[PDB]
Amino acid sequence: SYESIDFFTDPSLIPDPHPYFDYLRSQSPVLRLPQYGVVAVTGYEEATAVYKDTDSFSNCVALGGPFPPLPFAPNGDDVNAQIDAHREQFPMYEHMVTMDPPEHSRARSILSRLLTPSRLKQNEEFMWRLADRQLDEFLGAGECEFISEYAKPFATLVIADLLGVPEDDRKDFRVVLGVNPLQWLDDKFSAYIEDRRRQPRNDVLTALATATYPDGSTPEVIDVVRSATFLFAAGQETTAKLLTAAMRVLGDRPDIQRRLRENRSLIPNFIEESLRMDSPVKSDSRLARKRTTVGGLDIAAGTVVMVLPGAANRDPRRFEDPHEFRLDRPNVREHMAFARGVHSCPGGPLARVEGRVSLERILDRMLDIAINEDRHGPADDRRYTYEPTYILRGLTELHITFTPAG
Numbered sequence: 001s002y003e004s005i006d007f008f009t010d011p012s013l014i015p016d017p018h019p020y021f022d023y024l025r026s027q028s029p030v031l032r033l034p035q036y037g038v039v040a041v042t043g044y045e046e047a048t049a050v051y052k053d054t055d056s057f058s059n060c061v062a063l064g065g066p067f068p069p070l071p072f073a074p075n076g077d078d079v080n081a082q083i084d085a086h087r088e089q090f091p092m093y094e095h096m097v098t099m100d101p102p103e104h105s106r107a108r109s110i111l112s113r114l115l116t117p118s119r120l121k122q123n124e125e126f127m128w129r130l131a132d133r134q135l136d137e138f139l140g141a142g143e144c145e146f147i148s149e150y151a152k153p154f155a156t157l158v159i160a161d162l163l164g165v166p167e168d169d170r171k172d173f174r175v176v177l178g179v180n181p182l183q184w185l186d187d188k189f190s191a192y193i194e195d196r197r198r199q200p201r202n203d204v205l206t207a208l209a210t211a212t213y214p215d216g217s218t219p220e221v222i223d224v225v226r227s228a229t230f231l232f233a234a235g236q237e238t239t240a241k242l243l244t245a246a247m248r249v250l251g252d253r254p255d256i257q258r259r260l261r262e263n264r265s266l267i268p269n270f271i272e273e274s275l276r277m278d279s280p281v282k283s284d285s286r287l288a289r290k291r292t293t294v295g296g297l298d299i300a301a302g303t304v305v306m307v308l309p310g311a312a313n314r315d316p317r318r319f320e321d322p323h324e325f326r327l328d329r330p331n332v333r334e335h336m337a338f339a340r341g342v343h344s345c346p347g348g349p350l351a352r353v354e355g356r357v358s359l360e361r362i363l364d365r366m367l368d369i370a371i372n373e374d375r376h377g378p379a380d381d382r383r384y385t386y387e388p389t390y391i392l393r394g395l396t397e398l399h400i401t402f403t404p405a406g
Protein backbone atom coordinates (compact mmCIF):
# COMPACT_ATOMS: atom_id res chain seq x y z
CA SER A 1 0.00 0.00 0.00
CA TYR A 2 0.97 3.66 -0.34
CA GLU A 3 1.60 3.80 3.43
CA SER A 4 5.02 2.14 3.05
CA ILE A 5 5.71 2.41 -0.70
CA ASP A 6 9.09 3.85 -1.74
CA PHE A 7 8.60 6.61 -4.32
CA PHE A 8 12.28 6.50 -5.26
CA THR A 9 12.49 2.76 -6.04
CA ASP A 10 9.05 1.16 -6.57
CA PRO A 11 8.47 0.55 -10.32
CA SER A 12 4.70 0.37 -9.77
CA LEU A 13 4.69 4.19 -9.56
CA ILE A 14 6.39 4.76 -12.95
CA PRO A 15 3.27 4.29 -15.16
CA ASP A 16 1.19 6.88 -13.28
CA PRO A 17 2.25 8.54 -10.00
CA HIS A 18 -0.77 10.78 -9.55
CA PRO A 19 -2.96 8.38 -7.51
CA TYR A 20 0.02 8.21 -5.14
CA PHE A 21 0.53 11.99 -5.28
CA ASP A 22 -3.17 12.45 -4.49
CA TYR A 23 -2.84 10.14 -1.48
CA LEU A 24 0.13 12.14 -0.18
CA ARG A 25 -1.57 15.52 -0.67
CA SER A 26 -4.75 14.40 1.10
CA GLN A 27 -2.62 13.48 4.11
CA SER A 28 -0.83 16.85 3.91
CA PRO A 29 0.63 19.02 1.10
CA VAL A 30 3.91 18.83 3.06
CA LEU A 31 4.42 15.24 4.23
CA ARG A 32 7.32 13.35 5.81
CA LEU A 33 7.81 10.20 3.71
CA PRO A 34 8.33 6.76 5.33
CA GLN A 35 11.91 6.48 4.00
CA TYR A 36 15.04 8.64 4.01
CA GLY A 37 13.45 11.45 6.03
CA VAL A 38 12.35 13.15 2.82
CA VAL A 39 9.63 15.78 3.08
CA ALA A 40 7.44 15.52 -0.02
CA VAL A 41 5.69 18.69 -1.21
CA THR A 42 2.61 18.04 -3.35
CA GLY A 43 0.86 21.37 -2.72
CA TYR A 44 1.06 24.31 -5.09
CA GLU A 45 1.31 27.20 -2.64
CA GLU A 46 3.70 25.20 -0.45
CA ALA A 47 5.95 24.36 -3.40
CA THR A 48 5.98 28.05 -4.31
CA ALA A 49 7.07 28.94 -0.77
CA VAL A 50 9.94 26.41 -0.91
CA TYR A 51 11.08 27.58 -4.35
CA LYS A 52 11.20 31.26 -3.40
CA ASP A 53 13.18 30.74 -0.16
CA THR A 54 16.87 30.25 -0.94
CA ASP A 55 17.99 31.13 2.60
CA SER A 56 16.29 28.01 3.99
CA PHE A 57 16.51 25.64 1.01
CA SER A 58 19.69 24.89 -0.93
CA ASN A 59 19.92 23.49 -4.46
CA CYS A 60 22.91 21.27 -3.65
CA VAL A 61 20.67 18.17 -3.91
CA ALA A 62 18.37 19.56 -6.62
CA LEU A 63 18.77 16.69 -9.10
CA GLY A 64 18.42 13.52 -7.05
CA GLY A 65 17.38 14.52 -3.54
CA PRO A 66 18.14 11.65 -1.14
CA PHE A 67 20.37 9.94 -3.75
CA PRO A 68 23.31 9.97 -3.59
CA PRO A 69 23.65 10.26 0.20
CA LEU A 70 24.89 13.56 1.57
CA PRO A 71 28.70 13.87 1.50
CA PHE A 72 28.62 14.48 5.26
CA ALA A 73 26.66 13.57 8.38
CA PRO A 74 24.19 16.40 9.08
CA ASN A 75 24.04 17.72 12.63
CA GLY A 76 22.88 20.84 14.43
CA ASP A 77 20.39 23.44 13.28
CA ASP A 78 22.65 24.67 10.45
CA VAL A 79 24.40 22.63 7.75
CA ASN A 80 25.68 25.57 5.68
CA ALA A 81 29.30 25.01 6.73
CA GLN A 82 29.00 21.34 5.78
CA ILE A 83 27.50 22.21 2.39
CA ASP A 84 30.31 24.70 1.72
CA ALA A 85 33.00 22.19 2.73
CA HIS A 86 31.70 19.60 0.23
CA ARG A 87 30.35 21.91 -2.48
CA GLU A 88 32.25 20.13 -5.27
CA GLN A 89 30.90 16.67 -4.33
CA PHE A 90 27.23 17.05 -5.25
CA PRO A 91 26.18 15.79 -8.69
CA MET A 92 26.35 18.53 -11.34
CA TYR A 93 28.08 20.80 -8.80
CA GLU A 94 29.64 22.66 -11.73
CA HIS A 95 26.24 23.73 -13.08
CA MET A 96 24.00 26.58 -12.04
CA VAL A 97 21.09 24.30 -11.13
CA THR A 98 22.97 23.13 -8.02
CA MET A 99 24.33 26.54 -7.01
CA ASP A 100 23.15 28.87 -4.27
CA PRO A 101 23.86 32.58 -3.82
CA PRO A 102 26.32 34.08 -4.51
CA GLU A 103 27.61 31.51 -7.03
CA HIS A 104 24.25 31.08 -8.75
CA SER A 105 23.75 34.62 -10.07
CA ARG A 106 27.20 34.72 -11.66
CA ALA A 107 26.74 31.41 -13.47
CA ARG A 108 23.21 32.28 -14.65
CA SER A 109 24.29 35.73 -15.87
CA ILE A 110 26.49 34.12 -18.55
CA LEU A 111 23.29 33.02 -20.35
CA SER A 112 21.96 36.57 -20.71
CA ARG A 113 23.32 37.36 -24.18
CA LEU A 114 21.80 34.11 -25.49
CA LEU A 115 18.28 34.98 -24.31
CA THR A 116 17.77 38.51 -25.61
CA PRO A 117 14.58 39.17 -27.59
CA SER A 118 16.76 39.60 -30.69
CA ARG A 119 18.47 36.24 -30.20
CA LEU A 120 15.27 34.35 -29.36
CA LYS A 121 13.55 35.92 -32.39
CA GLN A 122 16.27 34.60 -34.70
CA ASN A 123 16.21 31.21 -32.97
CA GLU A 124 12.40 31.05 -33.21
CA GLU A 125 12.43 31.75 -36.95
CA PHE A 126 15.15 29.09 -37.28
CA MET A 127 12.82 26.56 -35.61
CA TRP A 128 10.39 26.77 -38.55
CA ARG A 129 13.13 25.67 -40.95
CA LEU A 130 14.44 23.01 -38.54
CA ALA A 131 10.98 21.51 -38.03
CA ASP A 132 10.57 21.05 -41.79
CA ARG A 133 14.06 19.55 -42.16
CA GLN A 134 13.35 17.06 -39.37
CA LEU A 135 9.95 16.14 -40.81
CA ASP A 136 11.57 15.71 -44.24
CA GLU A 137 13.58 12.81 -42.78
CA PHE A 138 10.63 10.48 -42.17
CA LEU A 139 7.37 11.98 -43.50
CA GLY A 140 7.27 9.61 -46.48
CA ALA A 141 7.11 6.59 -44.17
CA GLY A 142 3.70 7.47 -42.72
CA GLU A 143 4.95 6.37 -39.30
CA CYS A 144 7.78 7.12 -36.93
CA GLU A 145 9.07 6.54 -33.44
CA PHE A 146 8.57 10.15 -32.46
CA ILE A 147 11.25 10.52 -29.77
CA SER A 148 14.22 9.22 -31.75
CA GLU A 149 13.09 10.51 -35.16
CA TYR A 150 11.80 13.98 -34.25
CA ALA A 151 11.68 15.11 -30.63
CA LYS A 152 15.22 14.33 -29.44
CA PRO A 153 17.02 15.57 -32.62
CA PHE A 154 14.87 18.71 -32.74
CA ALA A 155 15.53 19.63 -29.11
CA THR A 156 19.26 19.05 -29.63
CA LEU A 157 19.46 21.16 -32.78
CA VAL A 158 17.48 24.07 -31.27
CA ILE A 159 19.94 24.43 -28.38
CA ALA A 160 22.88 24.14 -30.78
CA ASP A 161 21.41 27.04 -32.76
CA LEU A 162 20.77 29.03 -29.58
CA LEU A 163 24.45 28.64 -28.64
CA GLY A 164 25.67 29.76 -32.07
CA VAL A 165 27.33 26.44 -32.94
CA PRO A 166 29.01 26.75 -36.37
CA GLU A 167 26.87 25.27 -39.13
CA ASP A 168 29.55 22.74 -40.10
CA ASP A 169 29.60 21.38 -36.52
CA ARG A 170 25.86 20.96 -35.94
CA LYS A 171 25.62 17.47 -37.45
CA ASP A 172 28.33 16.27 -35.06
CA PHE A 173 26.44 17.78 -32.13
CA ARG A 174 23.31 15.86 -33.10
CA VAL A 175 25.24 12.58 -33.36
CA VAL A 176 27.33 12.80 -30.18
CA LEU A 177 24.57 14.26 -28.00
CA GLY A 178 22.08 11.81 -29.50
CA VAL A 179 32.75 8.44 -26.09
CA ASN A 180 32.02 10.71 -23.13
CA PRO A 181 29.47 13.23 -24.49
CA LEU A 182 29.96 15.66 -21.60
CA GLN A 183 33.73 15.75 -22.11
CA TRP A 184 33.27 16.05 -25.89
CA LEU A 185 30.96 19.01 -25.24
CA ASP A 186 33.43 20.69 -22.87
CA ASP A 187 36.33 20.26 -25.29
CA LYS A 188 34.36 21.67 -28.23
CA PHE A 189 33.12 24.73 -26.36
CA SER A 190 36.46 25.35 -24.64
CA ALA A 191 38.07 25.76 -28.06
CA TYR A 192 35.18 27.92 -29.29
CA ILE A 193 35.57 30.39 -26.43
CA GLU A 194 39.38 30.38 -26.58
CA ASP A 195 39.26 31.09 -30.32
CA ARG A 196 36.72 33.92 -30.04
CA ARG A 197 38.62 35.54 -27.16
CA ARG A 198 41.83 35.75 -29.20
CA GLN A 199 40.05 36.78 -32.43
CA PRO A 200 36.55 38.14 -31.80
CA ARG A 201 33.87 37.70 -34.45
CA ASN A 202 30.40 39.09 -35.09
CA ASP A 203 28.69 35.91 -33.92
CA VAL A 204 26.94 34.41 -30.91
CA LEU A 205 30.00 32.59 -29.55
CA THR A 206 31.96 35.86 -29.38
CA ALA A 207 29.12 37.49 -27.44
CA LEU A 208 29.41 34.54 -25.07
CA ALA A 209 33.21 34.77 -24.93
CA THR A 210 33.12 38.49 -24.07
CA ALA A 211 30.34 38.42 -21.46
CA THR A 212 31.06 39.91 -18.04
CA TYR A 213 29.73 39.08 -14.59
CA PRO A 214 27.27 41.49 -12.94
CA ASP A 215 30.18 43.05 -11.02
CA GLY A 216 32.08 43.78 -14.25
CA SER A 217 34.72 41.07 -13.95
CA THR A 218 35.47 38.61 -16.73
CA PRO A 219 34.50 34.95 -16.21
CA GLU A 220 37.09 32.24 -16.60
CA VAL A 221 36.75 30.14 -19.75
CA ILE A 222 35.75 27.04 -17.76
CA ASP A 223 32.88 29.00 -16.20
CA VAL A 224 31.58 30.14 -19.59
CA VAL A 225 31.78 26.55 -20.86
CA ARG A 226 29.95 25.19 -17.81
CA SER A 227 27.03 27.62 -18.11
CA ALA A 228 26.77 27.31 -21.89
CA THR A 229 27.12 23.54 -22.33
CA PHE A 230 24.68 22.87 -19.48
CA LEU A 231 21.83 24.00 -21.75
CA PHE A 232 22.08 20.63 -23.51
CA ALA A 233 21.69 18.55 -20.34
CA ALA A 234 18.95 20.86 -19.08
CA GLY A 235 17.03 21.30 -22.33
CA GLN A 236 17.34 18.15 -24.43
CA GLU A 237 15.51 15.43 -22.48
CA THR A 238 12.88 17.62 -20.81
CA THR A 239 11.86 19.30 -24.07
CA ALA A 240 11.87 15.96 -25.92
CA LYS A 241 9.48 14.51 -23.34
CA LEU A 242 7.15 17.53 -23.65
CA LEU A 243 6.97 17.26 -27.45
CA THR A 244 6.22 13.54 -27.19
CA ALA A 245 3.63 14.03 -24.45
CA ALA A 246 1.92 16.57 -26.71
CA MET A 247 1.88 14.03 -29.55
CA ARG A 248 0.50 11.30 -27.27
CA VAL A 249 -2.46 13.51 -26.42
CA LEU A 250 -2.92 14.42 -30.09
CA GLY A 251 -3.31 10.72 -30.90
CA ASP A 252 -5.32 9.75 -27.83
CA ARG A 253 -7.62 12.80 -28.10
CA PRO A 254 -8.61 13.20 -31.77
CA ASP A 255 -11.20 15.76 -30.65
CA ILE A 256 -8.36 17.98 -29.44
CA GLN A 257 -6.38 17.30 -32.61
CA ARG A 258 -9.45 18.43 -34.57
CA ARG A 259 -9.84 21.66 -32.58
CA LEU A 260 -6.15 22.59 -32.92
CA ARG A 261 -6.06 21.94 -36.66
CA GLU A 262 -8.95 24.37 -37.25
CA ASN A 263 -7.87 27.00 -34.66
CA ARG A 264 -4.08 27.19 -34.44
CA SER A 265 -4.35 29.88 -31.75
CA LEU A 266 -5.27 27.08 -29.31
CA ILE A 267 -1.79 25.53 -29.69
CA PRO A 268 -0.18 27.60 -26.88
CA ASN A 269 -2.93 26.59 -24.43
CA PHE A 270 -2.45 22.97 -25.53
CA ILE A 271 1.28 23.14 -24.79
CA GLU A 272 0.63 24.74 -21.39
CA GLU A 273 -1.88 22.05 -20.44
CA SER A 274 0.65 19.45 -21.59
CA LEU A 275 3.19 21.04 -19.23
CA ARG A 276 0.64 21.08 -16.39
CA MET A 277 -0.51 17.48 -16.93
CA ASP A 278 2.79 15.81 -17.93
CA SER A 279 5.40 18.01 -16.21
CA PRO A 280 8.75 16.65 -17.47
CA VAL A 281 10.61 17.36 -14.21
CA LYS A 282 8.86 14.98 -11.81
CA SER A 283 10.87 15.79 -8.68
CA ASP A 284 13.02 18.79 -7.86
CA SER A 285 14.80 18.72 -4.55
CA ARG A 286 16.24 20.98 -1.87
CA LEU A 287 18.29 20.60 1.31
CA ALA A 288 17.16 22.45 4.41
CA ARG A 289 20.08 24.71 5.30
CA LYS A 290 18.64 25.49 8.73
CA ARG A 291 15.70 24.45 10.86
CA THR A 292 12.61 25.90 9.19
CA THR A 293 8.86 25.49 8.67
CA VAL A 294 6.78 24.87 5.55
CA GLY A 295 3.12 23.87 5.44
CA GLY A 296 3.17 23.80 9.23
CA LEU A 297 5.85 21.08 9.35
CA ASP A 298 8.99 21.49 11.48
CA ILE A 299 11.87 20.64 9.13
CA ALA A 300 15.32 20.05 10.62
CA ALA A 301 18.57 21.21 9.02
CA GLY A 302 19.91 18.64 6.58
CA THR A 303 16.49 17.22 5.65
CA VAL A 304 15.78 16.67 1.95
CA VAL A 305 12.69 18.61 0.84
CA MET A 306 11.42 17.32 -2.50
CA VAL A 307 9.10 19.43 -4.67
CA LEU A 308 6.90 17.37 -6.99
CA PRO A 309 6.03 19.88 -9.74
CA GLY A 310 3.61 17.49 -11.43
CA ALA A 311 1.78 17.03 -8.12
CA ALA A 312 1.63 20.77 -7.43
CA ASN A 313 0.15 21.10 -10.94
CA ARG A 314 -2.74 18.85 -9.87
CA ASP A 315 -3.44 20.57 -6.54
CA PRO A 316 -7.26 20.94 -6.54
CA ARG A 317 -6.93 24.10 -4.41
CA ARG A 318 -5.50 25.69 -7.58
CA PHE A 319 -6.74 23.62 -10.55
CA GLU A 320 -10.39 22.57 -10.76
CA ASP A 321 -10.84 19.02 -12.07
CA PRO A 322 -7.04 18.67 -12.09
CA HIS A 323 -6.88 15.25 -13.77
CA GLU A 324 -8.87 16.55 -16.78
CA PHE A 325 -6.94 17.71 -19.85
CA ARG A 326 -8.68 20.97 -20.77
CA LEU A 327 -7.85 23.56 -23.45
CA ASP A 328 -10.15 26.01 -21.64
CA ARG A 329 -8.16 26.55 -18.41
CA PRO A 330 -7.81 30.31 -17.86
CA ASN A 331 -5.10 29.79 -15.23
CA VAL A 332 -3.18 27.08 -17.10
CA ARG A 333 -0.13 29.35 -17.35
CA GLU A 334 0.06 29.28 -13.53
CA HIS A 335 1.47 25.73 -13.59
CA MET A 336 4.96 25.32 -12.15
CA ALA A 337 6.50 22.88 -14.61
CA PHE A 338 9.39 25.37 -14.93
CA ALA A 339 9.59 25.94 -11.13
CA ARG A 340 9.68 29.36 -9.43
CA GLY A 341 12.25 31.60 -7.80
CA VAL A 342 15.82 32.37 -8.80
CA HIS A 343 16.22 28.96 -10.51
CA SER A 344 13.07 29.43 -12.66
CA CYS A 345 13.78 27.66 -15.94
CA PRO A 346 15.49 30.08 -18.37
CA GLY A 347 14.46 27.77 -21.21
CA GLY A 348 10.77 28.11 -20.42
CA PRO A 349 10.20 30.47 -23.36
CA LEU A 350 12.33 28.27 -25.62
CA ALA A 351 10.39 25.13 -24.69
CA ARG A 352 7.02 26.79 -25.30
CA VAL A 353 8.14 27.91 -28.75
CA GLU A 354 9.61 24.50 -29.62
CA GLY A 355 6.22 22.99 -28.77
CA ARG A 356 4.19 25.51 -30.76
CA VAL A 357 6.35 25.55 -33.90
CA SER A 358 6.78 21.76 -33.90
CA LEU A 359 3.05 21.13 -33.68
CA GLU A 360 2.29 23.83 -36.28
CA ARG A 361 4.34 22.09 -38.96
CA ILE A 362 3.37 18.64 -37.66
CA LEU A 363 -0.32 19.47 -38.11
CA ASP A 364 0.40 21.11 -41.48
CA ARG A 365 2.24 18.08 -42.84
CA MET A 366 0.59 15.15 -40.97
CA LEU A 367 -3.07 14.41 -41.53
CA ASP A 368 -4.84 11.90 -39.31
CA ILE A 369 -2.20 11.60 -36.59
CA ALA A 370 -2.76 8.38 -34.64
CA ILE A 371 -1.06 6.05 -32.19
CA ASN A 372 0.31 2.82 -33.67
CA GLU A 373 -2.00 0.07 -32.39
CA ASP A 374 0.38 -2.79 -33.18
CA ARG A 375 2.87 -1.13 -30.82
CA HIS A 376 0.54 0.46 -28.25
CA GLY A 377 -2.84 -1.31 -28.45
CA PRO A 378 -6.31 0.22 -28.73
CA ALA A 379 -7.22 3.78 -27.82
CA ASP A 380 -8.85 2.83 -24.50
CA ASP A 381 -6.28 0.16 -23.57
CA ARG A 382 -2.92 1.70 -24.44
CA ARG A 383 0.44 0.08 -23.66
CA TYR A 384 2.89 2.90 -22.90
CA THR A 385 6.29 2.78 -21.19
CA TYR A 386 7.58 5.64 -19.06
CA GLU A 387 11.23 6.22 -18.20
CA PRO A 388 12.17 4.30 -15.01
CA THR A 389 13.21 7.35 -13.01
CA TYR A 390 11.78 9.32 -10.11
CA ILE A 391 13.17 12.64 -11.41
CA LEU A 392 11.76 12.72 -14.97
CA ARG A 393 8.29 12.07 -16.42
CA GLY A 394 8.46 10.96 -20.03
CA LEU A 395 7.71 8.21 -22.54
CA THR A 396 10.55 5.92 -23.52
CA GLU A 397 9.17 5.69 -27.09
CA LEU A 398 6.02 6.67 -28.98
CA HIS A 399 5.14 4.98 -32.27
CA ILE A 400 2.71 7.06 -34.33
CA THR A 401 1.05 6.84 -37.73
CA PHE A 402 -0.11 9.61 -40.04
CA THR A 403 -1.13 10.39 -43.59
CA PRO A 404 1.46 12.68 -45.21
CA ALA A 405 -0.10 15.91 -46.45
CA GLY A 406 2.30 16.09 -49.42
Ligand code: HEM
Pocket residue numbers: 059062096097098108159162230231234235236238239242279280281284309337338339342343344345346347348350351
Ligand atom coordinates in the same frame (compact mmCIF):
# COMPACT_ATOMS: atom_id res chain seq x y z
C1 HEM B 1 9.68 21.09 -21.03
C2 HEM B 1 10.94 21.51 -20.95
C3 HEM B 1 11.64 21.95 -19.63
C4 HEM B 1 11.27 21.78 -18.35
C5 HEM B 1 10.03 21.06 -17.78
C6 HEM B 1 12.26 22.40 -17.50
C7 HEM B 1 12.22 22.42 -16.12
C8 HEM B 1 13.12 23.07 -15.31
C9 HEM B 1 12.99 23.28 -13.88
C10 HEM B 1 11.82 22.80 -13.00
C11 HEM B 1 14.07 23.95 -13.46
C12 HEM B 1 14.35 24.40 -12.01
C13 HEM B 1 15.29 23.44 -11.29
C14 HEM B 1 15.61 24.05 -9.94
O1 HEM B 1 14.72 24.09 -9.06
O2 HEM B 1 16.76 24.52 -9.76
C15 HEM B 1 14.92 24.20 -14.61
C16 HEM B 1 16.13 24.86 -14.61
C17 HEM B 1 16.91 25.13 -15.72
N1 HEM B 1 16.58 24.87 -17.04
FE1 HEM B 1 14.86 23.97 -17.68
N2 HEM B 1 13.23 22.94 -18.31
C18 HEM B 1 12.88 22.70 -19.63
C19 HEM B 1 13.59 23.09 -20.74
C20 HEM B 1 14.79 23.79 -20.74
C21 HEM B 1 15.45 24.36 -21.89
C22 HEM B 1 14.89 24.26 -23.33
C23 HEM B 1 16.59 24.95 -21.46
C24 HEM B 1 17.69 25.71 -22.24
C25 HEM B 1 17.69 25.93 -23.55
C26 HEM B 1 16.66 24.76 -20.03
C27 HEM B 1 17.67 25.21 -19.21
C28 HEM B 1 17.63 25.29 -17.84
C29 HEM B 1 18.66 25.82 -16.97
C30 HEM B 1 20.02 26.40 -17.44
C31 HEM B 1 18.23 25.72 -15.71
C32 HEM B 1 19.00 26.18 -14.44
C33 HEM B 1 18.31 27.43 -13.90
C34 HEM B 1 19.00 27.95 -12.66
O3 HEM B 1 19.56 27.12 -11.90
O4 HEM B 1 19.01 29.19 -12.44
N3 HEM B 1 15.55 24.05 -19.62
N4 HEM B 1 14.31 23.65 -15.72
